[PDB]
DNA sequence: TTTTTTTTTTTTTTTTTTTTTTTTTTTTTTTTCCTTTTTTTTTTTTTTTT
């Protein structure tokens, strides 16, 4: 009952992963969106126990449309409480594969530590974590959440040029929103919001990312 | 004679409990009662004595 539930999650997580990168605009193949069970059954196997497939072998690697050399790291930790240790792995093997970007799907949580380690190792490579509860659900998906688009400089430049806006007089989106944290988003973007509506069909909001 | 391995000691968070603090619809009309009080010190008065 452990391999098969084990199995099932990790597809599930593996799908959502993807779903993620495609929606970052990182260059996903179609069938890897529509990968079923039985197609990750065949190709990583069934038994995570006798590590078919392991932990570290569901290392994604994915790159970006417009630049080829941007390209996210996903990691598959086993370890439930992460320190360290893997983390200096990780960021070692960064550096030597020279890719920014990175996600740590972790299973129950980091260390303190961990975290300020991510936070001070920020502003040269991206670091970014998941607890594996939260990857179980494509939040986007929901129907209460509508529909999310990053906008580049150029579009918020547009945008506070026609409206007059001042940045700090937008509305604002927490760092910390799953959304956000869906997204990738950093301080400072402009996340713009397209919702239906029942009064005028739909309606397009714009949040600051603080 | 140096390296690993155990122990120690901070270090930062967590989590629960306790404490604190602030709040409690709008307007209007009549009476009643109180707006000191006993204690201590000071000053004047009255009676008594030589």
Request: one cysteine or more.
């Amino acid at each position: 009952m452990d391999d098969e539930a084990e199995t099932y999650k990790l597809w599930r997580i593996r799908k959502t992963i993807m779903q993620l990168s495609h929606d970052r605009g990182y260059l996903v193949t179609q069938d890897e969106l529509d990968q079923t069970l039985e197609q990750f059954k065949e190709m990583f196997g069934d038994k995570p126990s006798e590590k078919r497939p392991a932990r570290s072998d569901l290392i994604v690697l994915v790159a970006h449309n417009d630049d080829p050399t941007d390209q996210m790291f996903v990691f598959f930790p086993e370890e439930p409480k992460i320190g360290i240790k893997t983390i200096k792995t990780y960021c070692t093997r960064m550096q030597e594969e020279n890719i920014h970007r990175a996600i740590v799907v972790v299973q129950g949580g980091m260390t303190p530590s961990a975290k300020q380690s991510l936070v001070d190792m920020a502003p040269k490579y991206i670091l970014e974590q998941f607890l594996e509860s939260e990857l179980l659900i494509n939040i986007t998906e929901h129907e209460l959440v509508p529909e999310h688009v990053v906008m580049t400089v150029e579009e918020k430049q547009e945008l506070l040029s026609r409206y007059k806006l001042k940045e700090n007089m937008l509305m604002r989106i927490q760092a910390g929103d799953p959304v956000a944290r869906y997204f990738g988003l950093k301080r400072g973007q402009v996340v713009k919001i397209i919702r239906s509506s029942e009064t005028a069909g739909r309606y397009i909001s714009y949040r600051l990312v603080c």
